[PDB]
Amino acid sequence: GMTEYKLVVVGAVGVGKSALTIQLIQNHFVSYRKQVVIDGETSLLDILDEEYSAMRDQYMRTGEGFLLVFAINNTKSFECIHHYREQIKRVKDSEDVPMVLVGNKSDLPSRTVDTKQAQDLARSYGIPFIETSAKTRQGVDDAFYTLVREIRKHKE
Ligand SMILES: Nc1nc2c(ncn2[C@@H]2O[C@H](COP(=O)(O)OP(=O)(O)O)[C@@H](O)[C@H]2O)c(=O)[nH]1
Ligand SMILES: *CCC(=O)N1CCN(C(=O)CNc2ccc(Br)cc2C)CC1
């Protein structure tokens, strides 16, 4: 009776992909599944489980929506976003794939990527940007819920 969405969290190593997922589900900071209610509608999210790692194309292809995560104190991680977005476009064979740009570790003061640079990038890609902290939970439900909204809009 309930929609199920396969979400992929992608980004450079140590940007907080795992921590974001654990925060979402367990509300704690040290596939995975969670049911959420968004706009009145219950959905089951299935979040599929070194500088950076390249992910299997077949794995990427199973995602219905993607969080593109970088860490706001890691400029190299922000550089990687382009490559992950290009991989998603390639494997999904579409310029229009549900995605959100996520700038993580917003609780840290050592910032090297300005909110405005990321805002401008996300505008160029035509996607929402959300600053998050896996540590404080700031932004976390917003990132995932916004992604589900993107998926639902795309399906309509
Ligand atoms: N301060 C802070 N540290 C974070 C945040 N998210 C992740 N970390 C830390 O960053 C490191 C890498 O996080 P991890 O989830 O393993 O990154 P992944 O490789 O992208 O899955 C760990 O030491 C985490 O505790 C966050 O929002 N704030
Ligand atoms: C900073 C992030 C970055 O430079 N990249 C580029 C490499 N990459 C890929 O995902 C592309 N490589 C890839 C993927 C699947 C298969 Br099958 C084979 C290959 C070579 C990670 C992001």
Curated annotation (Swiss-Prot):
GTP binds at residues 11-19, 104-107. It comes from the Eukaryota. Its main location: membrane. GO terms for biological process: actin cytoskeleton organization; cardiac muscle cell proliferation; cytokine-mediated signaling pathway; epithelial tube branching involved in lung morphogenesis; female pregnancy; forebrain astrocyte development; gene expression; glial cell proliferation. The gene is KRAS. The keyword Transcription regulation does not apply. Belongs to the small GTPase superfamily. Ras family. Interacts with PHLPP. Interacts (active GTP-bound form preferentially) with RGS14. Interacts (when farnesylated) with PDE6D; this promotes dissociation from the cell membrane. Interacts with SOS1. Interacts (when farnesylated) with GPR31. Interacts with RAP1GDS1. Interacts (active GTP-bound form) with both SHOC2 and PP1c (all isoforms) to form a tertiary complex; SHOC2 and PP1c preferably bind M-Ras/MRAS, but they also bind K-Ras/KRAS, N-Ras/NRAS and H-Ras/HRAS. Interacts (GTP-bound form) with MAPKAP1/SIN1; inhibiting K-Ras/KRAS activity. Its EC number is 3.6.5.2. GO terms for molecular function: G protein activity; GDP binding; GMP binding; GTP binding; GTPase activity; identical protein binding; LRR domain binding; protein-containing complex binding. Changing residue 32 to A: Decreased interaction with MAPKAP1/SIN1. Changing residue 15 to I: In NS3; affects activity and impairs responsiveness to GTPase activating proteins; characterized by a strong increase of both intrinsic and guanine nucleotide exchanged factor-catalyzed nucleotide exchange leading to an increased level of the activated state. Signal peptide: none annotated. Changing residue 23 to R: In NS3; impairs GTPase-activating protein stimulated GTP hydrolysis with unaffected intrinsic functions and a virtually functional effector interaction. Ras proteins bind GDP/GTP and possess intrinsic GTPase activity. Plays an important role in the regulation of cell proliferation. Plays a role in promoting oncogenic events by inducing transcriptional silencing of tumor suppressor genes (TSGs) in colorectal cancer (CRC) cells in a ZNF304-dependent manner. The modification N6-acetyllysine is found at residue 92. It is a lipid-anchor. Alternates between an inactive form bound to GDP and an active form bound to GTP. Activated by a guanine nucleotide-exchange factor (GEF) and inactivated by a GTPase-activating protein (GAP). Interaction with SOS1 promotes exchange of bound GDP to GTP. SUPFAM superfamilies: P-loop containing nucleoside triphosphate hydrolases (SSF52540). It holds the Pfam family Ras. This is GTPase KRas. Acetylation at Lys-92 prevents interaction with guanine nucleotide exchange factors (GEFs). Lysine-depalmitoylation by SIRT2 promotes its localization to endomembranes in endocytic pathways. It catalyses: GTP + H2O = GDP + phosphate + H(+).
